[PDB]
Amino acid sequence: KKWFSEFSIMWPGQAFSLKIKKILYETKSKYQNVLVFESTTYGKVLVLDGVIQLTEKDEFAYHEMMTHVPMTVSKEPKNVLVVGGGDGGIIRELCKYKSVENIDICEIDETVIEVSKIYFKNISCGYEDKRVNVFIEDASKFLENVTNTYDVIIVDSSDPIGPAETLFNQNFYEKIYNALKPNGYCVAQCESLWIHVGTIKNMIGYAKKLFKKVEYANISIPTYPCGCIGILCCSKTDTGLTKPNKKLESKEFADLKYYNYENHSAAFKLPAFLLKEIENI
Amino acid sequence: KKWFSEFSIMWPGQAFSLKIKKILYETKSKYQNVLVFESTTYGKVLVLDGVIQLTEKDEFAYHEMMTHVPMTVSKEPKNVLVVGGGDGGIIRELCKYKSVENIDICEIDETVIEVSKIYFKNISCGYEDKRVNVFIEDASKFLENVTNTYDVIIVDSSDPIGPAETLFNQNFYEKIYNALKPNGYCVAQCESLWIHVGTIKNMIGYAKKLFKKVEYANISIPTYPCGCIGILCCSKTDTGLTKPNKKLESKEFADLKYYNYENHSAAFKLPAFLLKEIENI
Numbered sequence: 001k002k003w004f005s006e007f008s009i010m011w012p013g014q015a016f017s018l019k020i021k022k023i024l025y026e027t028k029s030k031y032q033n034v035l036v037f038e039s040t041t042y043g044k045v046l047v048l049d050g051v052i053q054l055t056e057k058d059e060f061a062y063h064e065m066m067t068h069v070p071m072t073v074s075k076e077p078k079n080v081l082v083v084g085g086g087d088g089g090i091i092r093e094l095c096k097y098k099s100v101e102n103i104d105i106c107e108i109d110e111t112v113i114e115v116s117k118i119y120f121k122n123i124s125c126g127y128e129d130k131r132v133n134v135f136i137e138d139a140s141k142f143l144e145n146v147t148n149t150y151d152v153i154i155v156d157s158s159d160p161i162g163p164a165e166t167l168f169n170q171n172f173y174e175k176i177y178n179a180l181k182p183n184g185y186c187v188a189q190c191e192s193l194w195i196h197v198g199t200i201k202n203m204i205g206y207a208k209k210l211f212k213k214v215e216y217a218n219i220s221i222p223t224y225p226c227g228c229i230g231i232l233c234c235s236k237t238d239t240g241l242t243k244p245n246k247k248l249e250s251k252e253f254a255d256l257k258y259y260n261y262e263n264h265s266a267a268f269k270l271p272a273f274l275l276k277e278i279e280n281i
Numbered sequence: 282k283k284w285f286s287e288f289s290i291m292w293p294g295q296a297f298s299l300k301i302k303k304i305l306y307e308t309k310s311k312y313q314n315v316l317v318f319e320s321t322t323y324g325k326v327l328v329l330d331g332v333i334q335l336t337e338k339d340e341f342a343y344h345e346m347m348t349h350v351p352m353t354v355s356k357e358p359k360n361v362l363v364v365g366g367g368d369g370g371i372i373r374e375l376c377k378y379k380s381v382e383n384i385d386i387c388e389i390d391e392t393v394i395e396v397s398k399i400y401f402k403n404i405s406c407g408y409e410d411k412r413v414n415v416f417i418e419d420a421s422k423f424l425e426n427v428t429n430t431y432d433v434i435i436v437d438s439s440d441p442i443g444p445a446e447t448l449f450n451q452n453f454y455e456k457i458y459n460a461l462k463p464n465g466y467c468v469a470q471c472e473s474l475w476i477h478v479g480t481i482k483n484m485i486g487y488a489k490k491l492f493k494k495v496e497y498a499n500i501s502i503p504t505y506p507c508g509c510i511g512i513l514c515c516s517k518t519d520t521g522l523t524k525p526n527k528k529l530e531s532k533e534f535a536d537l538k539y540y541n542y543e544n545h546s547a548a549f550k551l552p553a554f555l556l557k558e559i560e561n562i
């Protein structure tokens with residue numbers, strides 16, 4: 001069998017590889033190269049522009065922490081926006097909340113959505129839900145135009161190289177600011193503390209220019225570079241996102257595989273070198 | 282430039298790779314294959330039997346958490362044992378404690394020690410310290426013979442395949458039990474929650490057969506398989522290892538890069554699926 005290997009200039013001098021059972025689908029969409037394969041040990045794998053975006057084995061770590069962090073802090077969230085997140089993992093976790101009334105998803109590339117509906121039926125099952133509304137558009141354009149404001153905005157983008165390039169700037173964070181309710185929350189995918197401290201420092205400067213509370217958490221996920229991924233957490237109220245305001249005790253949440261009440265706060269407890277870097281910001 | 286790739290049957294279907302700047306030393310010692318290279322982005326790298334044992338870039342994460350967890354719980358530790366840990370990283374962190382009077386290290390392979398003294402002079406610098414006593418021996422034999430008992434025992438072994446094979450059993454944990462003071466602590470290297478739950482379940486059954494409190498913590502380290510490594514924490518008193526009994530505030534600790542008072546407790550906050558697996562044990 002052959003191996004898929006994940007090289008990038010965004011993590012120079014290192015690579016992570018998975019063994020391929022069979023290749024399932026490959027294409028050049030309007031925005032990116034799309035690859036789906038079955039791996040021998042991580043289940044099916046979505047690769048976009050050569051970078052692992054998700055695998056069946058560990059996807060729940062990122063989707064649960066990205067969703068249930070902000071959704072346990074927001075008191076009664078009604079209107080939620082997902083930016084990117086074509087695969088549907090976030091949406092799946094959002095549908096567990098009976099209080100949610102609407103879920104807008106703004107994803108630039110419909111190939112991602114359709115591929116996910118076909119090959120990742122346990123991830124993309126949230127699309128069945130009547131509350132979900134799909135907009136195929138650059139979130140950068142979408143956030144300049146939206147009329148609604150949102151209780152939570154979850155930014156589940158790919159890397160700064162490619163289509164997500166328009167989301168890694170000051171102007172984008174202003175649009176997130178204006179699209180949020182007076183007391184709303186944003187969580188954004190924010191790279192790895194092991195290799196991307198320059199970027200984390202930028203993203204935090206952008207956010208702090210606008211939000212009352214910017215906080216950074218970290219998720220263990222083995223198929224992302226360095227085995228972890230940060231979440232940039234932005235708050236309009238002074239309280240922030242480190243403390244859950246509810247426990248997830250209904251039958252909808254009995255199946256949670258990573259998130260719990262205790263590791264919500266823990267994820268915000270960062271290595272010493274990172275804290276040293278991010279407090280003259 | 283060529284790439285070093287880390288394959289193993291202990292993590293089938295995945296591999297992590299580093300780019301090689303130059304190979305520094307290679308040998309077949311009495312127990313294992315030894316390789317030292319300079320990588321392009323992770324500094325120098327020690328590989329033993331084809332498995333990355335440490336790199337300069339992230340070694341502090343594992344050494345600080347392995348050492349300062351138990352050393353902040355032990356009230357006034359005088360006599361500390363390191364099992365394995367030929368490179369000297371643990372010893373370096375132990376020497377920061379002015380209360381420590383003796384440090385025995387039991388390492389099977391002196392090639393590891395000497396290679397570390399030559400190529401990893403920032404890791405192996407603790408060997409200068411007059412309190413350190415080196416025993417070249419299988420820890421399995423050493424613990425059956427030692428006359429002293431220890432305040433802390435830190436088990437900083439390699440994987441169950443090879444020389445460390447004798448350390449992954451019930452009998453070994455009895456020897457650790459008998460070599461500890463009435464109120465002493467053991468911390469042992471305990472594989473990755475992402476791939477080694479079978480093993481974690483075994484190690485915990487062995488420990489719980491003997492110790493009042495067995496607890497598991499987790500460290501983010503990018504150059505180990507899945508980007509993380511667990512610590513099996515064993516206690517003879519009912520309190521356990523989750524809570525520091527001191528802050529590391531003296532000039533010796535001003536340089537700490539990972540460990541702090543807050544992420545000591547956080548590391549013990551495990552993903553939901555792992556907790557589900559380890560409590561009918």
Ligand SMILES: C[S@@H](CCCN)C[C@H]1O[C@@H](n2cnc3c(N)ncnc32)[C@H](O)[C@@H]1O
Pocket residue numbers: 053054083084085086087088089090106107108109112137138139140156157158163164165166167
């Ligand atoms: C599939 S998801 C992978 C993470 C696991 N939930 C990453 C998505 O970000 C989308 N993306 C990237 N850039 C944009 C922009 N600019 N706008 C909207 N969506 C985007 C991209 O098409 C992926 O589907």
Ligand SMILES: C[S@@H](CCCN)C[C@H]1O[C@@H](n2cnc3c(N)ncnc32)[C@H](O)[C@@H]1O
Pocket residue numbers: 334335364365366367368369370371387388389390393418419420421437438439444445446447448
């Ligand atoms: C270098 S250390 C790497 C982790 C970073 N501190 C791993 C050590 O475990 C030793 N080891 C392995 N098995 C044993 C036994 N059985 N006894 C003592 N030491 C051992 C092995 O020689 C490495 O030096």
Ligand SMILES: C[C@H]1CC[C@@H](N)CC1
Pocket residue numbers: 051052053156157158159189224225229
């Ligand atoms: C969701 C994102 C996808 C690309 C990154 N490299 C990891 C996390």
Ligand SMILES: C[C@H]1CC[C@@H](N)CC1
Pocket residue numbers: 332333334437438439440470505506510
């Ligand atoms: C210290 C140990 C070395 C081998 C393991 N695979 C990672 C952690």
